[PDB]
Design a protein around this ligand. Structure first.
Ligand SMILES: *CCC(=O)N1CCC[C@@H](n2nc(-c3cn(-c4cc(Br)ccc4O)nn3)c3c(N)ncnc32)C1
Length: 256
């Protein structure tokens, strides 16, 4: 469907000129304001003259995003605008990603935040795999989006390993392979060295350390199925525990 903007159930007919460009957030992703209501959204622009490889990837991801309306852990699309020269994809405006939150924090991200993040990411990967046969496998702090409402969603679409590395980086503030100078050197350390587990002297719960250890299983045959990973006590704890991610997000973004 094209030519419509749906923000919270209210459906509006709209064209690209009904949006005011508030600047690049960076492909190109704009922050735009819907003049009719004042709502602010994220808009991804795909140029018809663009690279064939980049456009093909954009259209594949949009196909999944349009089918993922029933997953609360995937960034939602509000509508599309097709012009003679461009395609404008209206997405819900998130705050920032976990990589930038780590940079503003200038230190480890608390376990209670990573607990809610873990529950959101795993259920997004399981949804993508179960409902659409998509194997993401490329989870990193730059793909995990958060907003001031406390929401945690995936964007920009074997998977268990990259989640474990992302959790170790965010829990320690240190990327486990920061001293590798090439991509091949990273692959050698992944295969030759023991998995980079969580430190034991940072007050991490046994559930958190167990979950990261299960994610960083080198033998692919020994990695758990999703129905097993969704039963891990670390997932069970933060499925129900009250964690004020929204207030923590605002406090971190208030840092200079
Ligand atoms: C880690 C955070 C960061 O540095 N960036 C770069 C600038 C844009 C930021 N950002 N991206 C989105 C977004 C992207 N997509 C998307 C849609 C399709 Br269809 C295909 C591929 C992608 O990546 N949806 N949403 C952002 C949103 N929605 N809000 C705020 N910032 C966003 C990420």
């Amino acid at each position: 469907q094209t030519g419509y903007l749906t923000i919270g159930g209210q459906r509006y007919q709209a064209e690209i000129n009904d949006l005011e460009n508030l600047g690049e957030m960076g492909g190109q992703v704009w922050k735009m304001r819907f003049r009719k209501t004042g709502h602010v959204i994220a808009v991804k622009q795909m140029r018809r003259s663009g690279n064939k490889e980049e456009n093909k990837r954009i259209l594949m991801d949009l196909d999944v995003v349009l089918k993922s309306h029933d997953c609360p852990y995937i960034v939602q699309c509000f509508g599309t605008f097709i012009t003679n020269t461009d395609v404008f994809i209206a997405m819900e405006l998130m705050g920032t990603c976990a990589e930038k939150l780590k940079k503003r924090m200038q230190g480890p991200i608390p376990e209670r935040i990573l607990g809610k993040m873990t529950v959101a990411i795993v259920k997004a990967l399981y949804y993508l795999k179960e409902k659409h046969g998509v194997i993401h496998r490329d989870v990193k702090p730059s793909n995990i989006l958060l907003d001031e409402r406390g929401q945690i969603k995936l964007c920009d679409f074997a998977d268990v390993w990259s989640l474990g590395i992302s959790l170790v980086e965010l829990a320690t503030g240190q990327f486990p392979y920061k001293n590798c100078k090439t991509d091949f050197e990273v692959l050698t350390k992944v295969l030759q060295e023991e998995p980079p587990l969580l430190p034991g002297h940072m007050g991490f719960s046994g559930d958190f350390q167990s979950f990261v250890k299960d994610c960083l299983t080198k033998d692919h045959r020994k990695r758990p199925k999703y129905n097993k990973l969704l039963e891990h006590s670390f997932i069970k704890r933060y499925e129900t525990l009250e964690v004020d991610v929204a207030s923590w997000f605002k406090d971190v973004m208030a840092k200079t």
